[PDB]
Structure formats: C-alpha cells, structure tokens
Amino acid sequence: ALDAAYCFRNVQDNCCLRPLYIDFRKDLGWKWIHEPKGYNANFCAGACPYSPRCRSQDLEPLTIVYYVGRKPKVEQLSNMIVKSCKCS
Amino acid sequence: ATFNMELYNTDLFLVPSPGVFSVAENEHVYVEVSVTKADQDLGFAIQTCFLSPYSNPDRMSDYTIIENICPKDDSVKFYSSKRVHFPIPHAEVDKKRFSFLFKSVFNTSLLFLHCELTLCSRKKGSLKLPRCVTPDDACTSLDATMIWTMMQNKKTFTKPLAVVLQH
C-alpha cells in the first residue's frame, strides 16, 4: 500500500516508504521530550508517474513523556510516524 | 525586537551585576529577561531555565529550575514588573523577573545559566503565536501540542556564573 510490508521487501526507486530512526535531541533539537530517546519516524520518497510528489498518507501518533514543572505528563503526540505513502 | 538577560544584586532589580556574577551555596540569583520590541501585541514566556557546566545550551543538564513555564525548583519566586504605581527602570522594555536559591550540585568554579524564551501573543488573533500563559496557568494545565507550538519561536540566552565555596 506503499507501506512497510510492500516497500521494505521491494526496495526500488519509485515512491515508497523509507525506514528512518530519529533521535529527538540529536536529530530534531527537541530537548523537552524526556522519553523516548528516539523513534522510527520513517519518510516517503521516490519517483511518481504523471506534477505529483511522493508524500505521506497514513500517519500514527507517538506516546511521549515530558514535564511541566515537576509534573510528569504522558501524552500521545499525533502525526509522528509515517506508515504509508502515496503519489499526489 | 531585541532581547537580553541580566543578573542583579538583589530582589530590588536596581543594580545589574558587574562582571561575572559570583554566587555561593544558599545565596540567591536574581534574573531579569527583557525584550525591546515595536509590536505591543508581542510577548514572551520564560519556557525553560537550567544551570550547566557546559557553555553549549544543547548539552543536557539535571539542574533544571523552570521546565515549560512552571517552575521545577521549589525555591523559584516570580516578581511583577507590570505593577501600577511601582515603576521600574527603562519603560521601553518589557521584563520578566524571577529568583532561585543556588544549590551545590556541581563541583566547578564556573557554571552557565541557560534560559530559553518562547514568543506569544498578548492580544487575540493579532499574531501567529500562541497566547501568553502565566506560570500559574501552566502548572494547572499545559499540554504537549501547546508546548510543541511554543517551541517553534524560541530564543536562548546564556550567562556565566562564578561559583565560590564558603564555610
């Protein structure tokens, strides 16, 4: 579906999901997320037919731990994980 | 729009400290953050402040004083600078002031105070910024989506501290 099951087996130059781990402090500069240290965000890339572009289709949230004062908070941040791609 | 951070001798915030502010355990640090801007609709929040042995504010530290507006350290006190009949110096400047009690947690004669601010809108709809939230409001409730929004427009400041040992 241009998802992991298809794209990770059929590695190709056309539009497809690409695996990608992101470390919050090292790669994004988001210092305020205490946990997790990083996560698999993935991205979408590759050629498309006919002027469309390879972009995200299904996105999933990520559970994070942050602090307000001394209060720990756990919440689900939407739009964090790319699960599938589409030509658009 | 220009910003500054300065340390003062006392809670009167009258005399900015010359040189490298020198502190010992159980003494207070008086911090004033300021902005000189043209747009009255522009405000700021003190998002996060911490002390570290590293001059690089990207370096992690466990001595956190304020975390997401709400103070984390029990010694933090905020002071008003917007009190009618209570004048402060430099009117063209909008300020936020706080203090903390210095705790011996590091073993160095030199530390850095790092504070990051985030921009905010003082008036509804005018600016493309979240509305200003006081520390009291943030402690009761402040969520991840709002924090992510505030972090999009942020400035970090660093001042060195000279740490003295005492009997």
Author numbering:
A (entry chain B): 1 to 50, 75 to 112
B (entry chain A): 15 to 181
Passage from the reporting paper:
Betaglycan (BG) is a transmembrane co-receptor of the transforming growth factor-β (TGF-β) family of signaling ligands. It functions by enabling binding of the three TGF-β isoforms to their signaling receptors and is additionally required for inhibin A (InhA) activity. BG is nonetheless essential in vivo, where it binds and potentiates the activity of the three TGF-β isoforms (TGF-β1, -β2 and -β3) by presenting them to their signaling receptors, TGF-β receptor type I (TGFBR1) and TGF-β receptor type II (TGFBR2)4. BG, and a homologous co-receptor of the TGF-β family known as endoglin (ENG) which potentiates the function of BMP9 and BMP10, are transmembrane proteins with a large (approximately 760 amino acids) extracellular region comprised of two domains: the membrane-distal orphan domain and the juxtamembrane zona pellucida (ZP) domain19,20.
In spite of being a monomer and lacking the heel helix, mmTGF-β2 is much more soluble than TGF-β dimers and retains binding to BGZP-C25. This approach yielded high-quality orthorhombic crystals, enabling determination of the structure of the mmTGF-β2:BGZP-C complex at 1.9 Å resolution using X-ray crystallography. The BGZP-C binding site on TGF-β lies on the inner surface of the fingers of TGF-β2, involving residues L28, I33, V61, L86, I88, I92, K97, E99, and L101. The tips of the fingers of the ligand are also engaged and form contacts with residues located on the CC’- (P71, D72) and C’D-loop (N82, K86, D88), as well as the C’ strand (E81), with N82 being vital as assessed by Surface Plasmon Resonance (SPR). In contrast, in the structure of the mmTGF-β2:BGZP-C complex, the FG loop undergoes a disorder-to-order transition and forms a helix that also packs against the inner surface of fingers I-II and III-IV of mmTGF-β2. Hydrophobic residues A158, I161, W162, and M165 form crucial interactions with the concave surface of the growth factor fingers, including W30, W32, V92 and L101 and mutations within this region severely disrupted binding. The structure of the mmTGF-β2:BGZP-C complex shows that BGZP-C not only binds and engages the two critical basic residues on the tips of fingertips where TGFBR2 binds, but also occupies the underside of the fingers where TGFBR1 binds. For the BGZP-C domain, the key residues suggested by the mmTGF-β:BGZP-C structure, such as N82 and I161, were shown to be essential for binding, though most of the hydrophilic interactions occur between the side chain of one of the partners and the backbone of the other.
